[PDB]
């Protein structure tokens, strides 16, 4: 399980910092309640699109696992990269997925959770 | 899980003002992207006007630019197409598509894309 405070650092080392104008708050919690901070998880869908990454990157859309139908694999990076034991593949795609247009609105978690609350205490007190 | 149903359309003058209403009922929480296709008649189904439900950020195809409006509310899961300086083309029947997930921008137009849909509703240009 990665921790807290040392995956806000990473992340903002990797430069996610700021990006589509949200703090590492935002990111963190969102993170938190996607994979429980868990790079390896993996959920199942109706349509057959099975996430991936400790952000929970969706396949029909971002990675070609090559078992989801229609598959646009917007990212291009490979689902077993994002399952990497390092979470850079994870960020390099949600940077492109809140590029997309539609910012982070687009993850469920951060909808539900992390969408108009104290974002800010989650990363409180991490020294960073 | 949702089921879409319309309301509205019917026959308008050309030039006249049209609401065609549409609605979300069940598991509307999963609700994410609003859009109408039309089906015209010897045309394939095409997007018209892409929404969101949260964002409310409006994607409109290059026919219906600057013409259609489309906007949605979030305690009445409702969203309707408001339809200006209607004309002949314009004649064909709508369907209020749905998805449960976050489509791409790109493929906010593309039925594929989306997982629901609602019975057609006529709409007819004099």
């Known amino acids: 399980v990665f921790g807290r405070c040392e995956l806000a650092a990473a992340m903002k080392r990797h430069g996610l910092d700021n990006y589509r104008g949200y703090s590492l708050g935002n990111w963190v919690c969102a993170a938190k309640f996607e994979s429980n901070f868990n790079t390896q998880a993996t959920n199942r869908n109706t349509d057959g699109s099975t996430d991936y990454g400790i952000l929970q990157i969706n396949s029909r859309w971002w990675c070609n696992d090559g078992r989801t139908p229609g598959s646009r694999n917007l990212c291009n990076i490979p689902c077993s990269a994002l399952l990497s034991s390092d979470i850079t593949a994870s960020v390099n795609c949600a940077k492109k997925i809140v590029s997309d247009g539609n910012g982070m609105n687009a993850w469920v978690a951060w909808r539900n959770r992390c969408k108009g609350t104290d974002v800010q205490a989650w990363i409180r007190g991490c020294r960073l | 899980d949702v089921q879409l149903v319309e309301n509205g359309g019917g026959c308008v003058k050309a030039g006249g003002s049209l609401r065609l209403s549409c609605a979300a009922s069940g598991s509307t929480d999963s609700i994410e992207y609003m859009t109408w296709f039309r089906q015209a008649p010897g045309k394939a189904r095409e997007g018209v006007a892409a929404?969101?439900?949260?964002?409310?950020?409006?994607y409109y195809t290059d026919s219906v630019k600057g013409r259609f409006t489309i906007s949605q509310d979030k305690a009445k899961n409702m969203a309707y197409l408001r339809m200006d300086s209607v004309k002949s083309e314009d004649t064909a029947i709508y369907t209020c598509?749905?998805?449960?997930?976050?489509?791409?921008?790109?493929?906010?137009?593309?039925?594929?894309?989306?997982?629901?849909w609602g019975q057609g509703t006529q709409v007819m240009v004099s």
């Open positions: 929404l969101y439900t949260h964002t409310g950020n409006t």
């Open positions: 598509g749905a998805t449960r997930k976050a489509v791409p921008v790109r493929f906010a137009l593309d039925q594929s894309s989306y997982d629901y």
